[PDB]
Design a protein around this ligand. Structure first.
Ligand SMILES: Cc1nc(C(=O)O)sc1CCOP(=O)(O)O
Ligand SMILES: C=C1C=NC(C(F)(F)F)=NC1=N
Length: 219
């Protein structure tokens, strides 16, 4: 069957997202350090300019997935349903324009399904379509993606919970160790980030601090 709501919420705690172009250091090493530090979930997101393509992309994906397996953390693939199926990934994350969530849910069996949502209606539709979790953002100003909607703070998260919507939620967009707390307090089940860890001088320590911080506010 699909993942349980309870387990999904635990996995979203410290959700690290990264592609080879999000760090000036060795990509594979940064991922391994994030996992060693405490990341509870990892998403393979290789996009933008200078992104790896073809065999080079697959090899990185395979290495990232191996680090995830060895750390006992699920491996999520961004957008590429075919790759997710080919690599036997633990899940897939899709956006609003990328595909038809209902069709993706049917094609991936019981894999974890994540959908990016930005409005109340999108959140409700995602759950109805079969999503196991929703990614809401950008919470704070970001420069890593540079193709996001306007910053929305934690007001939408609060509104969703106020209505009684219980779907697992992860916040994303400009999240740092210093602004993560309010996201959890608003009702999110975790925080997702790229730069806060990928560009940190000490990725392992960064993930560790996030782990402790999220644990504290979820308690
Ligand atoms: C991939 C992505 N999506 C966003 C959204 O708002 O949907 S924000 C984002 C990435 C931002 O990375 P960082 O943690 O470095 O700000
Ligand atoms: C654009 C995105 C928004 N949210 C998430 C996640 F945090 F994983 F839900 N991933 C993305 N790729």
């Amino acid at each position: 069957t699909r993942i349980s709501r309870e387990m999904m919420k635990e996995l979203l705690s410290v959700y690290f997202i990264m592609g080879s172009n999000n760090t000036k250091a060795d990509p594979v090493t940064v991922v391994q350090k994030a996992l060693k530090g405490g990341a509870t979930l990892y998403q393979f997101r290789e996009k933008g300019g200078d992104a790896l393509t073809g065999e080079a992309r697959i090899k990185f994906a395979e290495k990232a997935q191996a680090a995830c397996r060895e750390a006992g953390v699920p491996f999520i693939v961004n957008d590429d349903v075919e790759l997710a199926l080919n690599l036997k990934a633990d899940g897939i994350h899709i956006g609003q324009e990328d595909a038809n969530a209902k069709e993706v849910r049917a094609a991936i069996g019981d894999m974890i399904l994540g959908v990016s949502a930005h409005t109340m209606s999108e959140v409700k539709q995602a759950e109805e379509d079969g999503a196991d979790y929703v990614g809401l953002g950008p919470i704070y100003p970001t420069e890593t993606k540079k193709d996001t909607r306007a910053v929305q703070g934690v007001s939408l998260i609060e509104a969703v919970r106020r209505q009684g919507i219980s779907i697992p939620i992860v916040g994303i967009g400009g999240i740092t160790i210093d602004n993560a707390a309010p996201v959890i307090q608003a009702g999110a089940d975790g925080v997702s980030m790229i730069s806060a860890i990928s560009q940190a001088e000490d990725p392992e320590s960064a993930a560790r601090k996030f782990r402790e911080e999220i644990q504290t506010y979820k308690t």
